[PDB]
Amino acid sequence: DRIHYTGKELSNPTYHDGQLSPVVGVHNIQLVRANREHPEASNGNGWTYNHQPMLAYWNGQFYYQYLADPSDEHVPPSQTFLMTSKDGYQWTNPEIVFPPYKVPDGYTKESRPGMQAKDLIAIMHQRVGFYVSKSGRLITMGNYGVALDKKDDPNDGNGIGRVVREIKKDGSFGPIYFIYYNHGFNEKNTDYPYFKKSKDREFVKACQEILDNPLYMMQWVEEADREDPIIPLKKGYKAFNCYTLPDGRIASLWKHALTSISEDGGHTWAEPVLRAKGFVNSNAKIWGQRLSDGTYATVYNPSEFRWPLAISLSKDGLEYTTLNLVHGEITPMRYGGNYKSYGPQYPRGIQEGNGVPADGDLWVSYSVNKEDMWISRIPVPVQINASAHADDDFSKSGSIAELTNWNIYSPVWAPVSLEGEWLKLQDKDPFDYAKVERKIPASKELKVSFDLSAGQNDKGILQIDFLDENSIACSRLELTPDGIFRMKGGSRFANMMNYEAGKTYHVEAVLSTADRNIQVYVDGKRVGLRMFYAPVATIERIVFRTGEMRTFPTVDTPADQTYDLPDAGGQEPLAEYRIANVKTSSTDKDASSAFLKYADFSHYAESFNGMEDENIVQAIPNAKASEWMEENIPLFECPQRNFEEMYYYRWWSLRKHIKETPVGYGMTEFLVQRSYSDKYNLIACAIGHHIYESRWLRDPKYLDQIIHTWYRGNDGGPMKKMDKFSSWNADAVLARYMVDGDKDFMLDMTKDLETEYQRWERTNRLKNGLYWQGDVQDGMEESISGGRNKKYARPTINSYMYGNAKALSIMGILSGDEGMAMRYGMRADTLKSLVENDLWNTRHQFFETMRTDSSANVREAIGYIPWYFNLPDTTKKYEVAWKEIMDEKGFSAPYGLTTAERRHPEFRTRGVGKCEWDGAIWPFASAQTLTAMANFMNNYPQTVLSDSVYFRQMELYVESQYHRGRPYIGEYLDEVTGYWLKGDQERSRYYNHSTFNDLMITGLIGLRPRLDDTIEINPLIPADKWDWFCLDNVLYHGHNLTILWDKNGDRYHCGKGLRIFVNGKEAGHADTLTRLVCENAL
Ligand SMILES: OC[C@@H]1O[C@@H](O)[C@H](O)[C@H]1O
Ligand SMILES: [Ca+2]
Ligand code: NA
């Protein structure tokens, strides 16, 4: 429909930069610095009105056209220059491309009776300067109008006409011809031939493409004859540009952000034309385009004044959501003159079809004060914030072109180069300074370090500011021209020390928002402590600048400037400064989180403590929980409310069970005092679940102690009641190692785990080799297949021990104990056969309990436990068992997965509300089933279950964890009604007898933990389920992982698609959601 702005962010015109934080890596590069007094090729021979640039990319080179008069706008002479560059930093000297044209003596106007032209030079004015033809030829174009005095209009449509000439591959120009004649002008009374007279047949064809193209005719409306038939839309809307939307339609922008649409390539435009709603724009033009990443961007002055120069982003070319800085400086205007006004202005980029710069970034040409010519480069995909602190070695970079993390303001006479290891700042400019900004993650506690060297101590200045997102400097450090390194405390400064030329100084600055101070160390010695002169919430930028900041101009300055400044062409004596090894760090508790911040999710914990009473308090009370969470949890977000809420609830629930005991932390299952628990109310049944979920906690002291408390909490040794429940806890300890990477912790647990395995082996094998367990001792009393006081061979314990044997064998390889590897290796092989041969029911095609005489002939949730440890072959015969996930006669029920198949006669026939396992949904089981389903779908060639099927069950598991409208994780629930079956009894509250966040992280987000240094993800969120999602602040293998998906690129602004970040640096990428693997990035 129409271009519009919906962002809340505004630009404040009492500041030069608007209090807009810039986007990352924007380089401001001055191309032309006016100097009347010392005219030269490189400044267009001392002309001081230089304005209205145009840009194109052709044969790997930038082409930059600007126009100039000697001093005053619409005061002759007047010409148009051309400039080139391979990289966009180092430019060739301005070359006169359209020279001054003679107005015929005796020219007149209706609006100027009695006046008539004598020896009068034409004024030039184009809204459009370039065209790449279909045959790859580059045509540049200009217009000549007439001004009989300074108050006259040469874009009145009584002009002379429009000229063109070819720019050739070799640099040289072709001849100059007219392409359009204003009324009363023709071949007979003009100084260049008509374009058609050229004998270059293809040059004519190229010129003719411009006339035939209606999108170019839209840009001639201002200068051309009024009502000329070749102008598609005849109303005089100003400085047209346009771009192609994703659907093929063309959107347009003119001055004051007027905007339309065209569904026929530019012949017609949707009435009524109106301002883009929510945009802030005036005279100084707006520029929009598509970018290499397929998104869009607008560049404009968001102000009735012509400052700052800003960028707003859009994913669809219509709805613009952001507003940040491109150019916030304002060189003061050296040379006065007619209609010149302060600030960066007339932004204009590359039309569609006229070039793609090889680096894929956004380059935009603009003037400053109608005086100096500039270009800015903005890295695409455009990034707002720094995903990673500084650790910059400049010797790795050949030229500033490669410093995509630094923002650079670089005037001609205050340039920014590299000198190997050093980022260098030169300043011989009285009216300007060199400035570099380094944007970093917004931080409350901040350390910043770098080496600093001056080339002098008797001249110039350097200011070091520490800014927030609204450009508030919280303190400043200064190298003074009277030889001192000092800090700003308030109005008063503090002299920290003297300084010397040519000497490296290691500067470290330690800033704290909370404490509201800065400490400055130089060579390990503290040399200054002051308070902030201005308070901030966070610091996001360090700025190095070769000058004091400039107060002029302001919103109250008069727009017209009659004066030149004193010594306008002169120079300061050269000052140099150098910096190297810029490091930053933060002690903030979520500093490891690359994109998400805990403050945006702190509300979840707040809601949970407010929503209901705190019945039982153990080590971490509710009042400290929000805080514990910040320190310990990976952050997650997605567009779906329930999944997100559950993510934060299951950590907030889990933490209640961290319990203080004399021998260390332990992890409870019931909060209430159970009659049969061991010491400290501990229960062994779900230790597997506890470890699998708690391994993602970042502070290891909790899980370290919880484990040690089981195996060593009872006079040095194991707790007694590990004899009471079957265990997969050796697999679970090796599951922990796969997430934290800590060999030592694990290898230390090996004997304790061998003791355990061997105990179960002595006590609980039948004579054929299979393990037996009574259904009670699996934690599954009154199960259908069963066995209260029975020694049936249940696929639970048999699979748990397969897992344990497999685990201990691996611990053997890593121990260096090749005997233990083998011994437990064969224990693994053996149990794998006994399950595959003796427990596969061949009628049912399903793993099932074997009673003393034959199979129990009932499919239960336990029949999916062999895949919890990847027990089965990849053969197709087993795939069929997973069909029962999607069958309402099997396990598919309204609120998730049943514990037994629903088709069975005996399903849920042993009463209710006393913990029965003959059908009802048990989170314990559901989590075993989903972990196994995850393993199936990840590690097996497999056609039975889609992404959608996995997601469905996790979604149902989310929906099931509510009670009275609030989140709730109870013991067990009704498969049809969703009723938690102990009701409002206290004992079921916050029950810790399952996983959820392991499932979120390992199945859904699909971070697959491994023994080695490959990172493997494989989300089971289906294509198009969610426009974005992100798992951040994960402590995998002593490195900080972020995993994110951004369909349109507009959620995180770091690219489209799926991405892995290790410590905030990208490690891999994928256009869709599939398996994405990053080798050796740890
Ligand atoms: O069915 C739940 C039982 O009670 C819990 O204490 C144990 O985990 C399990 O044996
Ligand atoms: Ca200066
Ligand atoms: Na701001």
Name the helicity range. Answer: 10-25%
Number of helices: 15
Judged by helices, strands and strand pairing, the structural class is: alpha+beta
What is the assembly state of the chains in this entry? monomer
- Calculate the terminal CA-CA distance, rounded to whole Å: 48 Å
Biggest beta sheet summary: 11 strands, mixed
Pfam families: Beta-prop_BT_1020 (PF24067), BNR_2 (PF13088), Glyco_hydro_65C (PF03633), MGH1-like_GH (PF22422), Sialidase-like_CBM (PF22585)
Domain BT-1020-like N-terminal beta-propeller: 1-237
Domain Glycoside hydrolase family 65 C-terminal: 1011-1066
EC number: 3.2.1.18
Overview features:
binds calcium ion; Neuraminidase; monomer; 8-stranded antiparallel sheet; elongated; 1082 residues; binds sodium ion; alpha+beta; binds alpha-L-arabinofuranose; 17% helix; EC 3.2.1.18; Exo-alpha-sialidase; 15 helices
Describe the structure.
This is Exo-alpha-sialidase. InterPro entries: 6-hairpin_glycosidase_sf, 6hp_glycosidase-like_sf, Beta-prop_BT_1020, BT_1020-like_b-sandwich_1, Glyco_hydro_65_C, MGH1-like_GH, Sialidase, Sialidase_sf. This protein has 1082 residues and is an alpha+beta fold. The chain has a domain of 399 residues: 6 Propeller (Neuraminidase). The protein is built from 15 helices and 54 strands. The strands form 13 sheets. Strands 21-22-23-2-25-28-37-30-31-32-33 form an 11-stranded mixed beta sheet, with no helix packed on it. Strands 24, 26, 27, 29, 34, 35, 36 and 38 form an 8-stranded antiparallel beta sheet that branches. Strands 7, 8, 9, 10 and 11 form a 5-stranded antiparallel beta sheet that branches. A hairpin with a 2-residue loop joins strand 52 and strand 53. The radius of gyration is 37 Å and the shape is elongated. The relative contact order is 0.07. It binds alpha-L-arabinofuranose, calcium ion (CA) and sodium ion. The site of sodium ion (NA) has 5 residues, from loops.
